[PDB]
Each structure stands twice: as structure tokens, then as C-alpha cells.
Design a protein around this ligand. Structure first.
Ligand SMILES: O=C(O)CO[C@H]1O[C@H](CO)[C@@H](O)[C@H](O)[C@H]1O
Ligand SMILES: O=C(O)CO[C@H]1O[C@H](CO)[C@@H](O)[C@H](O)[C@H]1O
Ligand SMILES: O=C(O)CO[C@H]1O[C@H](CO)[C@@H](O)[C@H](O)[C@H]1O
Ligand SMILES: O=C(O)CO[C@H]1O[C@H](CO)[C@@H](O)[C@H](O)[C@H]1O
Lengths: 445, 445, 445, 445
């Protein structure tokens, strides 16, 4: 009644209880109702949240994700659970098992990718394992032995097939690959997707999630599905995709994450005596994509811009993706101070109506802002976690601590919502979201 | 390495993670390997540990236990899980489904009982539910509606069938019913059990638990099983059991718990407008068994004694059961001060070699003390929990806090062992014990 | 900014910082400017707050107060700091140094008393000292050797001089002695106090606290000061006050505190082998004042009433003092359930407009309620602490816990105010009150 | 008894209690009896410890130190408390009031300096103040207005007067200025200090700390005091010290601190709009001293070496000062990995006999190691704090965390010692050291 918040220990217990409840055996669902399968970057966050509970089970999560890796290195964004339906588009719609020569054997997966946060999860598992003694270190190190080459092939497929022109930015062929499906970032690119006649479909996500204010519209999923048809018509061939996709964007946030991931993976490889050629490639990619992120930035504010490859125009929007350069580094001193000022000022974390000092997914003063609508305004604990972890790595200890502290306060209701209304703090969307429990577990220490 | 202990939040998360991992769906195993079924007083502790995580699931645990209640009110001490084997004596050995007219339908259970801590679990669920708002209160109150009469019938069967002469003490027909199977308390009663030819058996608990120093011997399980044959030969008939059992003891610790349970259940019934006749009976039983506990006590020390009904002699041993009167109250002032002095002095919590200020199951200076052997010396977190909760209820706030604090320190290794070596703090016995996680969760708040 | 409150460690640090900043050397001021001297029941709370910081300095605080005890055993309610002004009425107005034959020789004091919480402070000092090792235990035990006789003389003075008819209630000759100067409890008794020729004066208290809504009015002060003239005219002679005092009330809250204090001090004397005749006297007084409190109570609700000795009339008001019987026990079971229901319902802690689940000094629905006016409504952390500590001693562990939780949450702003607006939570009166810091330190542990 | 340590809240409270008890009013003593005056780098730590208690009082502590700054910008290492004795050498021995033209007019000080951690204290004060609201921010900002020029003059004095050749390292004329009086770093430099006619004296430091194994020897003090005679003979003239001083060493640890401090103060001047020419100077010095530190380093391990200016020889010793480059950055990637390996391995933090995972002041395997002797081996919480804070600024969040965790665990005894025996954990030297309390308060948050 008077205080619906949970104590830190009650909150940690409930978060761990949620993670174990979402565990199907070898994979954790992204969320029981809305997302009853394994999602790629949710799984990396899940592995971080499991690392304080069981290094063995955190490793199993990544082991299961990488068993679904495509022949060519791509980590698909969904690994479908054995016979679980409920979700759409499902494996039948994707048809990767019969169409894609690179699809894995005895996993059903999607045909698209998602951001490479996995090296970060590996670092956190390693750091936990080193606090727990010899046998737990053995587990983490045996994992590195098993999966280092798979991780390299993941990073190499991004660097060679989604940055074909060595521009230092990752090209996406669907907004789902950004992790921020309905972000204002992609409105103008989706606006140029004109679909033909697409096979008949019954939407599945809105049956469970009632409120249309906290879900995407019906015109969105028509184009969302047309892109799937385009990929199918070329059997998900990497060499043919540029010739046919009606959606081709360089995602600057995805690219900054990849830069950071490369640097983290490189330092792991140094510490664990991995092949020198692998470490050298990872440092080369880290620097290339740092450079590719900085090339997009506004000269006065430092704001990073996405790039629409088909239209050949910078996508200028006011979302949290503008702060990509803060994650990977590389901006000139003055331009970075300018970007921190934007982050902390009234267009983002300093907006006077915000309940928490946290980063809204879209600026409240932007014309595209919708306080309830996924990535068009709400605050996402997973973004708070990622910014706070990257800020700590830049040496911004106090900024990272402020994000953690406000993130823990917002999460203390124990809804483990995927996102929160930025003004009222109302939990929104799916409750029971695995990666919000994971963020809380990693924060609480 | 330097500090193998977990922080309070890490420990709470791991405890909740263990409880959810031990959940079969509607019941929680007492321990994954050694005890893969539902045990009666473990389940009550499990429900307490679940109450901070999910009032709904805490209620389900007790709902599942009471669906196995016998026609006559007895709560059996094991509810066997659907088809899980591994344990012995199993349902085949017990044969209650075909022999006992009172056995439940579509549960497999044992034919013996275990201490009535369930009202305490109900209180803790109620107290949690009242902090969580209207819908969670509705769940707890709907449970009371469903199960109040079952709880009354539980208490009434103890009061009328295991205290047939209204002496205010519970008679047991097997040491397993005490919850402290191999306690020195029962050595002289087991010594008078001479068995015939008992059906051939292969012990199951020692296959998983290697060390014979932390398990009971082979002569113990021969008599343990002979008693089972005696109960079978009279189809578990309550009226016939006194005529035939070779083991009949009044358990003073069990009786003190029942007294406390009656008082707790009575106060619940007052608060939730249960029938007046039920509340009045519960207060009558609380006072009868308080009186029955006090009648056993040594006039100088207050130590409570068990009673061997067949031998007609007070069982004088130096175990933690001597402190039964401290739980239920009723001793004269001076005699209670004397008993607290014994509890805190060098024969128990004040012994100079103890690692924690906690109650050893048997006094280290006793001839029967074995530092590694179950209830013959080790410290059990479940006993710490129960003494600390009962002490708080007597108003001994500081004593209760000291027990909690030392219990949390001992448990901070995260083994969730059932018992610990009293001198070195080594975790012993089964790890992953549900009710040790439960105690930690309730303590941490 | 986004959350003004402090973490538990920051709060504990700031409480300790305040307590040391108010330390004049051997005494601690009740508040820096408003109350720049030693108050008697504040000093007990101060000693409780110092015990986790320094047992040696906690003992010093009580040594200093007891060095000011009158020759007849009275502990006076103010011990003035040498050569400190800024509080009225000061030493010159009281004129005890010149008029009172029983006043101390090396100290300047007031000529009235205050509630006997001192034994509770001695119990907290002893409980802290027992956890800290041998040299610290010796410090606490030497304090007992040195001051047990003084504590007995304090309790004996109250029992014989302020309960001359052995009614088991404490008579007060000034509302200041209740600790609740402007409580509605005293309104009708004050209306019968007619000041005669009262020598001129200027308040100093409302030059520091200038908001007129937070302190008593001029008219109330004229009566407060006139009572001093009546005492001074008989030179503070115990034997003459009944014949001359225009204010004579039996204070049931003070009486319940005394009952508890006697029982606490008796238990200490048993533990530390004090003379048996003293322990016997203390247990006798504990019971006598318990019965005297219960004798006052409403037959339906259990509410305790003060008694106007001059008017020979029960004083019926709706203040926190009604709950006196919950502190000391003694009510029939049914009427204590009713009384608890009154405490927890809409007239007190369950009032729907309260910011915290705490006890307002006057019921929000009483005609006498004033949300800002001292003891006429505001929430006082000192009352919270006493209720929570005494509840825990009754065995009401969850009730005590909830009051402690809500008190920490209210106190988390770090103002250390003496009282708070019950609806908005605004801190009122003087900031930096030592006994609020002390409550916070004891709660946080 | 069973666990001597304190909870985080009890520890925080006791740290704050100590800091306020050492407060003389406008300055805080370094330790009650041993160091009963204001030491310069202790005072910076004191200001860090006060910032979560009172921004106003933290600012006062730095105001008091800066009011004692010399006319040429030097911050002297002792500001003597008015009319306080018990420390030698006191104001009369130093004779700065009479001999030093640059000494302050309203203050008595020493005639040597100490490391410039002051800018780090200003950053912590500002970070605290930004979380506390408008009036508190104004207090911190007014401090900046009032003292920025003084801080610049401090940094400028070091950069121009103690690095006259622009080598980017700070020359010291007394081992006391390093903060590490008896470090093995200075042994060979001290062996070349020959006292002439040295006026008689009695130590006061080893009358308080009487165990001869914890303080420097008589022979060391004769050299310490003779250096004072050489300074006094040239009236503390910066321009003459190079010609007369028998002790002239470049201190690489002091130099790294200065590099960090310059960078911190530059960042503050940018945030708070200080003159651009000042920010430019600070960034220039930051880089110059970073390069001067790196120039000293071992080509294989990265270890930094001090330089004996008179002997023109690198000083190779195995102390914590070797790790100077980790504070300020600048090493090539490979050699910093080597240096981190040295810090974490068996020669320092990974030595198998260490009670805590902390940095001993001298390596346990060095011939110079002495487990009790001041800076020749003991673990100093001040070093832990500086390393952990600077590590976090490098982005090594887990390394910084581990040092903070081990430092809290060592400090949890509440002794607030300045240094600890590396193997047993025994607190050494003076208890009640303010800057250990300050580190604990900052760590606990
Ligand atoms: O891809 C989709 O169909 C839906 O995507 C949403 O759910 C995923 C699982 O939680 C997240 O991985 C995404 O970030 C989020 O936007
Ligand atoms: O009954 C048995 O066969 C074995 O009994 C042991 O295991 C049970 C499950 O943990 C506990 O309920 C008992 O207290 C404990 O003694
Ligand atoms: O006695 C007075 O003159 C003023 O009294 C107030 O201040 C005292 C010091 O905090 C408290 O002890 C009282 O309870 C409170 O009513
Ligand atoms: O300078 C001195 O005479 C004595 O020096 C010691 O005491 C100081 C105060 O704590 C510290 O600042 C030094 O680091 C430490 O070495």
C-alpha cells in the first residue's frame, strides 16, 4: 500500500525467480507471453543476468544461441523453441529451414540478425567466473575454447557481409535487426517500402497485448512482412540481398555496439591467448566501426545519424541512437562534450517532466514522440543498462552510477516491464521481460 | 577466492533461483537429489520462502500438500511426485494406497506424519499478502476460505488421535515423525525395537550421499523398516496402532510446535472471522500442549524431556529439543531464565569451539555428539529459523536478531546445505536444500 | 533533484554526524538552537543512538544526566549547559539552585521531570556492549555498578512521590512532564489554570521556530510559566505540591512507560545480580502501573484515559496516548484486539490521507487535530520508535517491523526533524533533533 | 565475539562519527593524538569524506587549507592548529613564520609540500553537490568562484617551480613530500644525506605509537630533520634549494597524481566556464606529466622508476609507486598489460599470504619488505582508494570494484587505521585516522 516498492534483496530474489521461471531447459524465453522464444540480444542479456546465479547456466544460454548460428556466421535474431507457436511471423513464415543454404540443422531460426552485444555477455561471465574459484573458471574457459571461433565468425560475418564497402557501418535489411523495430529512425525508410500482394497473415502479438497505444500499427506489419518475402525470393543469399531489398539502412547504434563488442572480444582474446590474427582483426574492426560511427556525426552536437542506403540520405531523428558515439568513443573532445550536453539537457535526460533521470527512447520534444509507444518515447531498462555499462568503460564512473541508481529505482516495482512511460513511470508493454530482470540482477551486485 | 561469501542481494537471488529450480510445477522437492519429493514440514518452509516471491505460488504449495491430507485429518510426511523414483522407502514399500482406508485418492503418500509448522507458514503468507494490496490479499483470503477446515482437521487429528489421553503431548510411532530421525532422543526407544524378518530392501539414500559419517547406519534402517511393517499389518488404523507399535514416544518438541501452531491458527481465525467454536478449540489445544510441554521439564534447568510410552521412562538427552518450552511459553519465570542460561552457555550456543553463535542439534559436550552426523551435533538452518521466529514471538527481539544474523552469516556461502559442521562451518549432507533457501529468503527480507 | 532521499549508509552516516555535532563534550543538546541543553528523555534516546557508535560515550551521556538527579531521586527534565542561553525559561526563571533543597550541587536543572525511558536506553547499551567484546562489556557493567542505585532511586521517587495513593498511575504537575506539552490531552486541565501576578517574559522558542502554526500560543505559555510560580512558592517541596498546584493530572502514557521501564530494569537487575529486594520492588511497580493503566481503559475499545486529579474526571481525547496499554500489556485479550483495531484503522495509522503508515500524535478526524501544531497531529519519530520497540517486546514482530520501515522511509530525507506533517510529510519544528538521529541509527542497525 | 565486524550502516555511522570528532571547527586533524593538525593530502581525503555529510563543511575544509597557501602557490603539507602541541617538528622547528618570505600571514605551516589530490576532492564535492539540489550546488559553485585562482596557482607552482627543466616529473626536496616518508624508494637518496651540526630534539611521534616496528628509526629522523636545516638556511627560497638540498628526487607517483589532477581540474574548468587559458594550461600539464611518468618506465614490465636528481640515477625499487602509470595512462597497450599483470600477480595483490586482495606498499617478496613498518609493506586504505578511483576513471570498472570491495572488508573492523599488516590484517599505526574514515564513507555511498 504505502510503499509498493521492493527492497534490494526482495527485488534480486524476484528477478532471479523470474529468470528461472522463463527457462525452458536450455534457452530462456524473452518473455513468457509476448515473446515465448529465444531472441538474440535478449539472450546475451539473459546470460549476464544468469552469471551471478550460475556460470554454468549462463554459458548454456550462449551455447544454445551459438548452436543456432548460420553457416556463414550470422547469429539469427530468433531461435524458435521446440514446437512453441503463439508468435508470428513463425518458422513457417520465415521458411529458412528449406530456403537458406546457411540455415542451421535441427534449430528453427529467423532469417535476420540483431545487435552483437554477445561479447559483452562473455566479458561479464568471465568477470563473475574469476570471482568464484577454479572449477567455475574452468567452465568459463572451456566455453571460450568451444566458442571463440564461432564468436569470431559472428564478428567476421558482420564486418565482411554487412559492411561490404568497408565503410565501418552495419547495413540492415529490416528494422527488426536494429532491435528498435518501430523507432522513428526508420519511418522514412519504411515509407519507401511499397509491397505487392503478400501471403495472408493473422497478427499474433496484438492478441496478447491489448493496448494499441503500446504496440505498432497494421500498416507497419504489412511492410515488415513484404521485406521477408524479398529475402525469401533470393533464398537469404548475402550476395543477392543488395540487389533486391527495399529496405537498406546503415544503423549507427548497431555499429557503435559492434565497435565496442570488437574491442571487448579483442581484450578477451589477449587475456586468454587466442590466435594473434584474430585479436588483430578484432582491433581493426573496433577502430573501423568507431571511425564509421564518428563519420555520421553532426559537427556541432556530435549526434550520430543513421543512413538510408537506397535514398542516399542521412536519417536525422531525435532518438537515443544519436548517442551511439558515446558508447564506442572516437569523437573529438569538444564534440563529445557537446553530445554529453545534449544527453543531459532538456531534450533527453534533463527534460523537466521525466520521472527518472533516464534516457527516453525518443526525445519528448520531438514531433515523433509518443509516450506509450515502444521505442517512440518510453524508457527501456535494457538501454539504461547498456549506456551505463558503456559509460563505466569510458571512465565516466559517476554518470554510469546515476543511470544505474535511477534504473534500480524505476525497476523497484518488480514488474520487470520491457519499457516504462517516461513521465508517470507506469510499466508498459510486456511484463516479465527476461532482460529487465537481467539488468536488475547485474546492477544489484 | 579471498571472500567466497555472497552479498545479501546475490544470496537472495541464488536462494530464489534454487527454489524455482526445485519446483516440479505444483510441488517443490525438499532437495533435488536426496529428497526428490514433497516433505511435509519442508513444504511449509518452502511456502514461507515463496511468500516474498509469489503469494499465489506459496498458496499452491500448501494447496498441494493439503490435497494429500488423509480422510482422518493427518498430513502425511511425504507426498510422492508423479512417477519420481530414486527414494526409498517408496510408495510401494509404504503401500498406503491399498492398505489405508484414510489414504487420499490420486496422491501417493507415506503413512506417517511430521511436525505441524503449517499454521506458521500460513501466518507468513498472510503477512506478506497484507503488504501487497487488494488482489494479493484476495488470493491469501481465498486460500483461508478453501483450507481453513482442512487445517482444523489437521490440528484436530493431532489433538484427538495422537494425544488420546489428553496429556498435552503428541505420541509418535516412528522417529521419522519427529523430523529428527537419527537424534540421540530416540536411541533408547529404537534399542527396544527388535524386528522379525522384514521384506528385502536396497537402501537408496546412501547411494547419492557418499560419506557414511554424515548419514545413518544400516542397523537403523532395519528397525526403521520394521515399524513400517507393524503399521501395515493393522492397515494404519489409528485405533489399532497403540496395540501393536514397538515405538511409541511423546515428542516434546513436536508438542511445543503444535502449541505454537494452535495459538497462531487461533489468532488467524479471530482476524478472519472463522467459526468461534474452531478458535476456542485452537486456544484450548494451545494451552493443553503448552501445559503438556511444561510437565516434562526438569525443575532446576527447565530442560524438556521426551517420554517413551512403552518403557514408561523420561528420555533424558542433551539435544536442542530440550528447549521446546522456549517456543511455546508457559514455564515459571525462574525456570525459564534457567533454560535460557543453558541455551546460551557452554553446552550449547556458548560452546567455545563453535564457529557461529547458533544452536547445535546435540550439545558438543554430550556423549552422543557426532560433529558430522545429521541431528547428532550439526547446526541446521531450519532449526535456527524456527527458534528465531518463535523467540521474536516471545518478545525476545535481540535473541531472535542474533540467531538471524548468525544464520545469515553461516548461509552466505550459498551452498544451501541442510546442516553445517558446528566447529568448522563446513556445509554437510544434501546441498540445494529447499528449506535452507527458504529460511535465507525469509530472513533477508 | 529526482530523488531527494539518502541511501541507508548515507542516512546512518548523517545521523551519526549530527549526534556528534550536538555533543558539547559530556552532554548532547536536544537540538542546536531551539533546545541547546540536555533534555531528560531526549538524553535517553541520545544514549540509544550513541550505543552503536561508542558504548563509552553512551554511558557518559547517562552519567551526566544522573549526576543532575535530585537528592530525592527525581531526574529533572532539563540539565542546563554551563553558560548557555537562548532557551527560556532558563536557570534563573526556575530558581531551583536557590529554592529547591533537593536540587543537585554541581549542576543547573529544571524543577520538573519527564518520562522514564532511561531503563530502555540501559538495555540497548547492554545489548550493544554484549556484542562488542570484553573491554566494552566491562564499560557497561561498571556503569551498572556505579548507577544502579541511582536508577532505583529514580524509579522509587516516581513510585512513592508521584503515586502517593498507590493507584498505579503517575501524577504530573506540569504538562511539560508528559513530554507532550500542547497535547489536547491537557486542554481542559489547562483551562482551569488561572495565572495570577505573573512576572513579565519574552519567549525565545518562537524566535527560532517563527512559523506560529508549529509552536504553542502565547496564552498557553502564560499558563506554563504560572505553574512554575506555584512550584517555586513552595520551594519545589513534594509534600506541598498537592495542596498548591493548579495542574494535577495522572498521565497514563507516562504510567505505561514506567511499567515497561520497571520490567526492563528488573530484568537487567536479575541478569547482572543486583540486590534481590530491588528486583522485587521493580516487578511490583511494573505490575502496579500495568494495572493502573488498564483501570483507565474504555470498555469497548480499550483506549486509555488520563485522569484530572483536581476535577476528579476522566480525560477523553483522541491522541496517541490512548494506546498506552499496548506498550505495557494487561488488557483482556478481546479489548486489546479492539485497541489494535483502533490504532490500525481510519482514525489513526490507516487514515487514507497519511503519507506514511505511522501514528499521528492526534487523530486526523478529531476536532482537536491540527496538521502542523506540535503534538496536536504531527507524526513524531520518537513515538514511532517507542511503539515499535515496545511492540517487538510484546512479540508483535511484524507490527514493529512495519513501523520501523515507515519511520525509516519518512526519515530518509535527512532533516532529522522532531515531527512531520502527517499528510505531506513536510518536516516541521526544529531540524537537527538528536533523538530523531538516534531513532534512525537504532533502526538501521 | 563471533564476528567483530560492523554492518555497512554501522560502519558508515562510525566513520562519520570519527570525522566529526576530529573536527576542530574549521579544520580536521589527521589523527587525534599522532597527527593533531591539518595535513594537506589528508585534508583532501577529509573533504571527500565530508561531501556526503555536508557539502558546506567539505568546502570549509578546503577553504582552510587554501587559506594557508604560500604567496608563490605552494600548498604546505601541515597547517598547524592554533596553540596545539604534541607533534614534532612543530611550528618553531620549521620557523617558516619568520624565515619564509612566501609563508601565509594568518596561519602557521610547514615549509614543504605534499601530493596534489586536491582537484579530485573538488570533483567529488561537485558530484555530491549536483545530486543535492539548488542551494547546495550554489555552495559548491561559490567555492569554485572563490578558489579556482588558488587551485591554478597551486598547480602552476608545481609545474614551474618543481619541474624547472620541463621534464614532466615533480622534484621533491624531502621524502615527507611524497607522502611515503620511509618508503624504500628513498633509501639510497637518504644514504647520501649527511647531517651536520644538527640541533638537539626529542621525537613525539613514537611516544604515541610506541611499538618501534611501526614507525621510522632514530637514524631516519636525524636525516629528516637535517633537511629542514638546509631549507631554513636559504629561507625556503625556491631558487636556492637546487644549490643546497642534499635530497633531490623526482617522484613518479606524485607526478602521475599531478597528471590526473590537472586533467580533472581542466574538466572542471570547462564545465564551470573558467578562463580558457587556464584550462589550456591544465591540459598541457596533464599531458606533460603523463609523458614524464611514461619516460621512467621499465621496457619489459612498464614499472615506473623514481629519479635521483643529484646522483643522476634511476631508483629501482619494488613499491606501489611502480604502478604510477596506471593512474595517469600513457603506456603503450602491451606494456600496460604487463604492468597490470605485475600488480595482480604474486609480487603484489596476488601474493598467496595476503589477507586481502589489496596492494601492499612494498612487495612481500622484496628484500626491503617489512610487514609492520609504515610504507615498507603494510596495506594503506588511502592507496586502495586512489587506485580504485583512478582505475574507475580508466574505465576498469571491475578492477576498481574489486579494490573497493576488499578495502571495505579490511576496514569493516572499524579501527580506521592508516595501514594494516598485509598477512594478518592487524590494524597498525594510529587508529582513528580521518582519511581512512573518509575512504570508507566515499566507498559505501
Ligand atoms: O523482433 C520482434 O518481433 C519484437 O522485438 C521486440 O522484442 C524482442 C524480444 O524482447 C527484443 O529483442 C526487441 O528489442 C524488441 O523490440
Ligand atoms: O524422512 C526422511 O526420510 C529424511 O528426513 C530428513 O529429510 C527430510 C526432507 O528434507 C526432512 O523433512 C527431515 O527433517 C530430515 O531429517
Ligand atoms: O520541554 C520543553 O520546553 C519543550 O518540549 C519539547 O522539546 C523537548 C526536547 O526535544 C522534548 O523532550 C519534548 O517532548 C518536546 O515536547
Ligand atoms: O608527514 C609526516 O610527518 C607523517 O606522515 C604520515 O602522516 C600523514 C598524516 O596522516 C600522512 O599524510 C603521510 O602520508 C604519512 O606518511
Amino acid at each position: 500500500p504505502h510503499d509498493p516498492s521492493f527492497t534490494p534483496t526482495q527485488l534480486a530474489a524476484r528477478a532471479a525467480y523470474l529468470l528461472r521461471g522463463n527457462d525452458l531447459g536450455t534457452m530462456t524465453t524473452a518473455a513468457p507471453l509476448l515473446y515465448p522464444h529465444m531472441w538474440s540480444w535478449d539472450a546475451a542479456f539473459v546470460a549476464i543476468g544468469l552469471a551471478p546465479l550460475s556460470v554454468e547456466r549462463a554459458v548454456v544460454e550462449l551455447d544454445t544461441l551459438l548452436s543456432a548460428q548460420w553457416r556463414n556466421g550470422m547469429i539469427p535474431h530468433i531461435v524458435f523453441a521446440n514446437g512453441v507457436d503463439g508468435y508470428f511471423p513463425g518458422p513457417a513464415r520465415w521458411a529458412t529451414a528449406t530456403l537458406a543454404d546457411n540455415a542451421p540443422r535441427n534449430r528453427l531460426t529467423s532469417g535476420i540478425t540483431q545487435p552483437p552485444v554477445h561479447a559483452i555477455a562473455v566479458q561479464r561471465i568471465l568477470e563473475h567466473a574469476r570471482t568464484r574459484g577454479r572449477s567455475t573458471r574452468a567452465v568459463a574457459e572451456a566455453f571460450l575454447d568451444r566458442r571463440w571461433g564461432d564468436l569470431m565468425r559472428w564478428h567476421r560475418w558482420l564486418a565482411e557481409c554487412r559492411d561490404r564497402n568497408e565503410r565501418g557501418r552495419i547495413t540492415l535489411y529490416h528494422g527488426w535487426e536494429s532491435g528498435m523495430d518501430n523507432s522513428p529512425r526508420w519511418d522514412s525508410a519504411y515509407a519507401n517500402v511499397v509491397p505487392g500482394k503478400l501471403p495472408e497473415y493473422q497478427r499474433a502479438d496484438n492478441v496478447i497485448i491489448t493496448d494499441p497505444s503500446q504496440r505498432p500499427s497494421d500498416g507497419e506489419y504489412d511492410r515488415y512482412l513484404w521485406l521477408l518475402e524479398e529475402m525469401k525470393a533470393v533464398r537469404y543469399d548475402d550476395e543477392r540481398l543488395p540487389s533486391v531489398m527495399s529496405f537498406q539502412v546503415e544503423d549507427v547504434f548497431f555499429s557503435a555496439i559492434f565497435s565496442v563488442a570488437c574491442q571487448v572480444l579483442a581484450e578477451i582474446g589477449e587475456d586468454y591467448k587466442r590466435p594473434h590474427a584474430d585479436v588483430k582483426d578484432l582491433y581493426l574492426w573496433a577502430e573501423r566501426f568507431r571511425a564509421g560511427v564518428v563519420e555520421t556525426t553532426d559537427q556541432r552536437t556530435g549526434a550520430a545519424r543513421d543512413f538510408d542506403v537506397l535514398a542516399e540520405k542521412w536519417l536525422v531523428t531525435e532518438t537515443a541512437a544519436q548517442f551511439a558515439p558515446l558508447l564506442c568513443g572516437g569523437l573529438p573532445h569538444d564534440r563529445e562534450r557537446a553530445l554529453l550536453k545534449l544527453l543531459e539537457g532538456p531534450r533527453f535526460c534533463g527534460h523537466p517532466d521525466l520521472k527518472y533521470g533516464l534516457i527516453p527512447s525518443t526525445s519528448p520534444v520531438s514531433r515523433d514522440f509518443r509516450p506509450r509507444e515502444y521505442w517512440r518515447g518510453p524508457v527501456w531498462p535494457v538501454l539504461t543498462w547498456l549506456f551505463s555499462w558503456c559509460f563505466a568503460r569510458r571512465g565516466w564512473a559517476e554518470r554510469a552510477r546515476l543511470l544505474r541508481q535511477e534504473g534500480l529505482r524505476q525497476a523497484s516495482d518488480g514488474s520487470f516491464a520491457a519499457y516504462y512511460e517516461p513521465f508517470t513511470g507506469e510499466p508498459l508493454g510486456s511484463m516479465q521481460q527476461s532482460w529487465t530482470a537481467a539488468a536488475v540482477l547485474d546492477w544489484l551486485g
